[PDB]
Enzyme design. Structure first.
Site, PDB file in Angstrom:
ATOM      1  N   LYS B 311      13.875  33.779  46.888  1.00  0.00           N
ATOM      2  CA  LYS B 311      12.250  33.778  47.118  1.00  0.00           C
ATOM      3  C   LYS B 311      11.057  33.487  45.600  1.00  0.00           C
ATOM      4  CE  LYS B 311      12.142  37.336  48.139  1.00  0.00           C
ATOM      5  NZ  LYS B 311      14.313  38.441  48.305  1.00  0.00           N
ATOM      6  N   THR B 312      12.329  33.324  44.965  1.00  0.00           N
ATOM      7  CA  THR B 312      11.497  33.332  43.714  1.00  0.00           C
ATOM      8  C   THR B 312      11.995  31.920  42.966  1.00  0.00           C
ATOM      9  OG1 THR B 312      11.395  34.193  40.808  1.00  0.00           O
ATOM     10  CG2 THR B 312      13.996  34.259  42.297  1.00  0.00           C
ATOM     11  N   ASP B 365       8.133  37.197  39.106  1.00  0.00           N
ATOM     12  CA  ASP B 365       8.794  37.476  39.537  1.00  0.00           C
ATOM     13  C   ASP B 365      10.244  38.504  39.110  1.00  0.00           C
ATOM     14  OD1 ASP B 365       9.730  37.840  37.091  1.00  0.00           O
ATOM     15  OD2 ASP B 365      11.334  36.098  37.125  1.00  0.00           O
ATOM     16  N   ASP B 366      10.326  39.277  40.613  1.00  0.00           N
ATOM     17  CA  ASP B 366      11.520  40.469  41.106  1.00  0.00           C
ATOM     18  C   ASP B 366      10.808  41.406  40.266  1.00  0.00           C
ATOM     19  OD1 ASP B 366      13.792  39.095  42.413  1.00  0.00           O
ATOM     20  OD2 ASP B 366      14.107  38.401  40.193  1.00  0.00           O
ATOM     21  N   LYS B 393      -6.715  42.450  39.427  1.00  0.00           N
ATOM     22  CA  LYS B 393      -8.136  42.415  39.732  1.00  0.00           C
ATOM     23  C   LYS B 393      -9.395  42.074  38.459  1.00  0.00           C
ATOM     24  CE  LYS B 393      -9.150  45.766  43.197  1.00  0.00           C
ATOM     25  NZ  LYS B 393     -11.125  46.068  42.530  1.00  0.00           N
ATOM     26  N   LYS B 470      21.752  33.140  49.244  1.00  0.00           N
ATOM     27  CA  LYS B 470      22.414  33.025  47.726  1.00  0.00           C
ATOM     28  C   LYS B 470      23.063  33.667  47.970  1.00  0.00           C
ATOM     29  CE  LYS B 470      22.485  33.542  43.172  1.00  0.00           C
ATOM     30  NZ  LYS B 470      21.093  34.312  42.236  1.00  0.00           N
TER      31      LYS B 470
HETATM   32  N1  ATP Z   1      14.652  26.986  51.705  1.00  0.00           N
HETATM   33  C1  ATP Z   1      15.471  28.282  50.685  1.00  0.00           C
HETATM   34  N2  ATP Z   1      14.300  28.945  50.357  1.00  0.00           N
HETATM   35  C2  ATP Z   1      14.413  29.789  49.419  1.00  0.00           C
HETATM   36  N3  ATP Z   1      16.057  29.655  48.491  1.00  0.00           N
HETATM   37  C3  ATP Z   1      16.997  28.449  48.747  1.00  0.00           C
HETATM   38  C4  ATP Z   1      16.185  27.913  49.695  1.00  0.00           C
HETATM   39  N4  ATP Z   1      17.009  26.350  49.636  1.00  0.00           N
HETATM   40  C5  ATP Z   1      17.894  26.425  49.176  1.00  0.00           C
HETATM   41  N5  ATP Z   1      17.665  27.950  49.110  1.00  0.00           N
HETATM   42  C6  ATP Z   1      18.107  28.183  46.825  1.00  0.00           C
HETATM   43  O1  ATP Z   1      18.185  29.759  46.888  1.00  0.00           O
HETATM   44  C7  ATP Z   1      18.863  29.205  45.608  1.00  0.00           C
HETATM   45  C8  ATP Z   1      17.946  30.682  44.913  1.00  0.00           C
HETATM   46  O2  ATP Z   1      18.034  32.596  45.210  1.00  0.00           O
HETATM   47  P1  ATP Z   1      18.123  33.263  43.849  1.00  0.00           P
HETATM   48  O3  ATP Z   1      19.637  33.814  43.091  1.00  0.00           O
HETATM   49  O4  ATP Z   1      16.801  32.611  42.989  1.00  0.00           O
HETATM   50  O5  ATP Z   1      17.606  34.404  45.262  1.00  0.00           O
HETATM   51  P2  ATP Z   1      16.746  35.703  45.110  1.00  0.00           P
HETATM   52  O6  ATP Z   1      16.049  36.150  45.669  1.00  0.00           O
HETATM   53  O7  ATP Z   1      16.128  35.302  43.432  1.00  0.00           O
HETATM   54  O8  ATP Z   1      17.834  36.925  44.555  1.00  0.00           O
HETATM   55  P3  ATP Z   1      17.689  38.157  43.770  1.00  0.00           P
HETATM   56  O9  ATP Z   1      16.663  38.837  45.094  1.00  0.00           O
HETATM   57  O10 ATP Z   1      18.865  38.614  44.370  1.00  0.00           O
HETATM   58  O11 ATP Z   1      16.567  38.194  43.256  1.00  0.00           O
HETATM   59  C9  ATP Z   1      18.628  28.015  45.240  1.00  0.00           C
HETATM   60  O12 ATP Z   1      19.996  28.060  44.248  1.00  0.00           O
HETATM   61  C10 ATP Z   1      18.539  27.483  45.984  1.00  0.00           C
HETATM   62  O13 ATP Z   1      18.655  26.470  46.067  1.00  0.00           O
END
Ligand code: ATP
Ligand code: ATP
Ligand code: ATP
Ligand code: ATP
EC number: 3.6.4.6
Lengths: 237, 500, 49, 85, 171
Positions: B311-312, B365-366, B393, B470
């Protein structure tokens, strides 16, 4: 002492100067003759380094060399066509024992013709106000006038700082609210990019804690190159 | 403002009574071009020879020489005032790094000396009892805020002008002004596009802009330059062509660093279905909220999904896709070990400087990590929460527009902290639900060929999937490392246990 | 404690007469370098003649 | 061919402890150690001295100083066996 | 001479008796470790990996974690261990581990050992207590990537993983 003769073109041994004979002059070696104009036609600050005391850094040495010694070693005429002012202000940041002050040593003292003025850390600081700081301008005051009264062409002047992080830190966080080390740095900055726009120096600092060092000093032109050196790979090793 | 009084024909102000301005002050972040300006002023603008002072250059040890070096500056310009009252050759002074010499009188900390109060002599000289007219004085500082304001009030120094960073197209003038000579002697190709650069330079300013140039000429010569001799060839034919791009990539830091999305983005975005489009579309409809509307200068979003969904990362994607002037990522990476106060302080600096722009976007983030949150028992830091929930706000001044995102893998904790009530909206990230959707995704990736795709594909569609990316990456990878036949069987067996 | 104070202070110049008046004595010592030799000059040549 | 000048610091640890923005604000007056390690390993070769140092609390000392060439050798002396005793 | 990087000697401390093979379990496990280092060495798009070793207590966990690194022959290994951290307030504690990781982020790749995590982060069941700060810093670092091109693995140990599911570091 005749050097080259050209006819009106063949180069000949004995000839006859006539009205429309153009002539060029060149100062001899180890000469202090200042000839001006362009009825002339040399200074290269680097006569020899074959290899000096170094391995593993053939990338980094190449980068530093091309960046800050190529403007020096070039035809001057073309660079003033180019209209660029020489980069100055090397920085070196790394861990200990990776051969940084060696490197700094070799260029200043083995590569080019000058004696560099070196501070071992602070020598600067003094019990009396203003004279410690003044030593800075006591440093710069042998090279500044030299540019003023020889213009662009000049014998290079050099300053090697070392362990600069001690003397300089971010302002406002210094030994309390106002700070002790604040006014030395406000001079240093004032001179390096200073209103005189002296072009004839390079400042070589070195640290093991570069994040402390102020961005205000590190932006290009005051110290342009922040160059990491790090644990070598085996082949360098 | 300050040169009308010089240029006009004398009679007009003679009907007025205004005493002509003493001085100005200009400040801003470093490397932003101010000392250039202060040279040209006094170089070009006046007929006079300026006297420069460097900042501490005044100071000397003997108790009275410090002040007695200041009055030296103004004696000429006061004697000619005395001699010729109406007019003079406008003796001008240039200070540099003035913040040391003038700071608030009532701070002796670290100085432990009275000589900080030289300032009294200074401003008591400038207007003093004796008015000095037909003098100009200019200040220069990184730090505007530490100055005793007794000399910032008008008439001692009128103007507090803050030189900010260049605008993108003004940056072009800054660029073209340097490249004029380089092109004029035809050492510049027609292929390089200064605009192509200038859009690709987000925050480069002034010297930072000129640095690549100076470097570019170095890199361009060095080819034609080349051991013992280290000869410089005679060849004069060269130009830097699309090496300014390469060094723009590698060599300088921006001085305000966002450049790296890489740590956030390893793989970009795999476009793996309809959800990704729905999300990004919702996003480029949301970014417009700021830009169109002046009654919602602040807008606030959450990204809700399960963990390990990247998401981040796509938050950063949408940020760069908004292509705002100022963007930043408040990471727990950059802030580690910080006690709650400093952990607030970093954020503080972020929003305060972000407000400076006419707009910005920011991501958080997070948050569950940012504000430390663990059940076993609820425990977290509240101060960060309180601050943050205020910041949501806080409306910026006078319609300087803001967008904010936050991310969690968990909303069920949040609805008790009342954070998302404060947020304007939230958008969900569904995570991959099925074999077809998945197989399409990984064949966009690759690293299973059609036999393997099919070999998987028989038995996926009969099953229901709940997954995110991920985790999938590490799975395919570590399974990949095994010998060829074994690869897919191991992938499968891992999926059996992970998603169950 | 956790105390770091590193400080400086300024100088008091002893009144070293604080005027040019020193010159007049220095002028007398000029003249005693100056006006003395020609005595010997004319002395040795008075002795020659 | 010059002769040695040995220098003797009785207690190192008080003078120089780690300068890493630790033990409060920037150590204690850490400008000192910066000067020192610039001095002994400085741009001058300075081949003609050895400095002896002694601590009863060694770990504090900064590794920046302890590395080979500024001080290579850190030795421990420990309570002797019967023979030494 | 010891060095800034690995020593031959940090190991003999932690493995005094070495690792005797009593069965296939030992094989499977350390072969998986070998598998993982080859994953990291070879692969891209997994700059980091993260593993922990669960065991019951007094089943040698740390020995295995060391021998894995000792077999990986990666150039830079600094174990982060509680024994070298004693009495530390959570602030200086987390400074220490970050110092380790930042030195490690210099090299092109590395292997870092956390051991006795439940003692690294204060933990007690009764009225259950722990340091929050060290937790958060730890696991973001587990989720952190170094500058690109670099690669690492983070091995961890504990005698219990149930509370770690409860503390949401396991994912
Ligand atoms: N459509 C998409 N949406 C989200 N991530 C994607 C997408 N396509 C590819 N990715 C991949 O997601 C990866 C990043 O995952 P990341 O570890 O940021 O997930 P996260 O949600 O931050 O995990 P956590 O929730 O543990 O923090 C990147 O390498 C990216 O290429
Ligand atoms: N190519 C090299 N790389 C690294 N070290 C070298 C190299 N060549 C020689 N050395 C040795 O490295 C030693 C230390 O390096 P140097 O003299 O620059 O001080 P330094 O240890 O780098 O200083 P600091 O500890 O502040 O970084 C030198 O005394 C020299 O003996
Ligand atoms: N606006 C500009 N126009 C042209 N050149 C610039 C500009 N800004 C910076 N430069 C480049 O940088 C130099 C000027 O430095 P600059 O004015 O940024 O110092 P400064 O802003 O006073 O720094 P500080 O405020 O930290 O003292 C110029 O000589 C040129 O090389
Ligand atoms: N093949 C092996 N596998 C596991 N342990 C072994 C093996 N061979 C020997 N050992 C012994 O197991 C011991 C492991 O101690 P270790 O460092 O794991 O303590 P620990 O088990 O982590 O402590 P705790 O039980 O509190 O976690 C070593 O001293 C080692 O001698």
């Amino acid at each position: 002492l005749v050097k080259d003769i050209e006819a009106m073109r063949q180069k000949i041994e004995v000839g006859l100067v006539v009205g429309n004979s153009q002539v060029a002059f060149e100062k001899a070696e180890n000469s202090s003759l200042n000839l001006i104009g362009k009825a002339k036609t040399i200074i290269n600050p680097d006569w020899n380094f074959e290899k000096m005391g170094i391995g593993g850094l053939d990338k980094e040495f190449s980068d530093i060399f091309r960046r800050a010694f190529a403007s020096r070693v070039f035809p001057p005429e073309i660079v003033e066509q180019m209209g660029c002012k020489h980069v100055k202000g090397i920085l070196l940041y790394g861990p200990p024992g990776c051969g940084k002050t060696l490197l700094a040593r070799q260029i200043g003292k083995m590569l080019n013709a000058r004696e560099p003025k070196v501070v071992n850390g602070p020598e600067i600081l003094n019990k009396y106000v203003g004279e410690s700081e003044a030593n800075i301008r006591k440093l710069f005051a042998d090279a500044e006038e030299e540019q003023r009264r020889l213009g662009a062409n000049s014998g290079l002047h050099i300053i090697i700082f070392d362990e600069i992080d001690a003397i300089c830190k971010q302002r406002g966080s210094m030994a309390g609210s106002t700070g002790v080390h604040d006014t030395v740095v406000n001079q240093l900055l004032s001179k390096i990019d200073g209103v005189e726009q002296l072009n004839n120096i390079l400042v070589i600092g070195m640290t093991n804690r570069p994040d402390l060092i102020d961005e205000a000093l590190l932006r290009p032109g005051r110290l342009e190159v922040k160059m990491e050196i790090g644990l070598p790979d085996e082949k360098g090793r | 403002r300050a040169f009308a009084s010089r240029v006009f024909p004398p009679e007009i102000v003679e009907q007025m009574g205004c005493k002509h301005v003493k001085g100005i002050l200009l400040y801003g972040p470093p490397g932003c071009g101010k000392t250039l300006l202060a040279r040209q002023i006094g170089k070009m603008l006046n007929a006079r020879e300026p006297k420069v002072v460097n900042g501490p250059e005044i100071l000397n040890k003997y108790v009275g020489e410090s002040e007695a070096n200041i009055r030296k500056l103004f004696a000429d310009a006061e004697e000619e005032q005395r001699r010729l009252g109406a007019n003079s050759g406008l003796h001008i002074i240039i200070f540099d790094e003035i913040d040391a010499i003038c700071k608030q009188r009532g701070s002796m900390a670290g100085s432990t000396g009275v000589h900080d109060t030289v300032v009294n002599q200074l401003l008591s000289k400038i207007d003093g009892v004796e008015q000095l007219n037909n003098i100009l004085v200019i200040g220069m500082t990184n730090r505007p805020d530490l100055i005793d304001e007794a000399l910032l009030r008008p008439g001692r120094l009128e103007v507090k002008m803050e030189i900010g960073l260049p605008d993108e197209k003004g940056r072009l003038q800054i660029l073209h002004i340097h490249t004029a000579r380089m092109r004029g002697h035809q050492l510049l190709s027609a292929d390089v596009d200064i605009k192509e650069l200038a859009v690709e330079t987000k925050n480069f300013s002034g010297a930072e802009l000129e640095g690549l140039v100076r470097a570019a000429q170095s890199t361009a010569m060095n080819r034609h330059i080349i051991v013992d001799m280290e000869k410089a060839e005679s060849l004069q034919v060269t130009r830097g062509d699309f090496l300014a791009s390469l060094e723009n990539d590698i060599k300088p830091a921006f001085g305000t660093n966002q450049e790296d999305y890489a740590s956030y983005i390893m793989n970009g975005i795999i476009k793996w279905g309809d959800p990704v489009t729905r999300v990004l579309d919702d996003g480029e409809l949301l970014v417009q909220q700021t830009k169109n509307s002046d009654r919602t200068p602040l807008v606030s979003v959450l990204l809700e999904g399960p963990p390990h969904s990247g998401k981040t990362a796509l938050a950063a994607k949408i940020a760069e896709e908004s292509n705002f002037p100022f963007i930043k990522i408040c990471s727990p990476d950059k802030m580690i070990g910080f006690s709650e106060t400093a952990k607030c302080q970093a954020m503080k600096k972020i929003f305060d400087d972000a407000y400076k722009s006419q707009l910005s976007c920011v991501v958080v983030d997070d948050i569950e990590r940012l504000l430390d949150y663990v059940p076993i028992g609820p425990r977290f830091s509240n101060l960060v929460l309180q601050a943050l929930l205020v910041l949501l706000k806080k409306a910026p001044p006078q319609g300087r527009k803001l967008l904010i995102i936050g991310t969690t893998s968990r909303k069920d904790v949040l609805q008790e902290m009342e954070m998302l009530n404060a947020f304007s909206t939230t958008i969900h990230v569904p995570n991959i639900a099925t074999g077809e959707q998945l197989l399409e995704a990984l064949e966009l990736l690759g690293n299973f060929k059609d036999k393997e795709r099919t070999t998987i594909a028989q038995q996926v569609k009969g099953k229901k999937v709940w997954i995110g990316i991920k985790k999938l990456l590490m799975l395919i990878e570590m399974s990949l490392q095994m010998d060829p036949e074994y690869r897919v069987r191991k992938f499968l067996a891992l999926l059996r246990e992970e998603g169950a | 404690m956790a105390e770091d104070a590193d400080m400086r202070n300024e100088l008091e110049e002893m009144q070293r007469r604080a005027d040019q008046l020193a010159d007049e004595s220095l002028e007398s010592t000029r003249r005693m370098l100056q006006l003395v030799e020609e005595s010997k000059d004319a002395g040795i040549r008075t002795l020659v003649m």
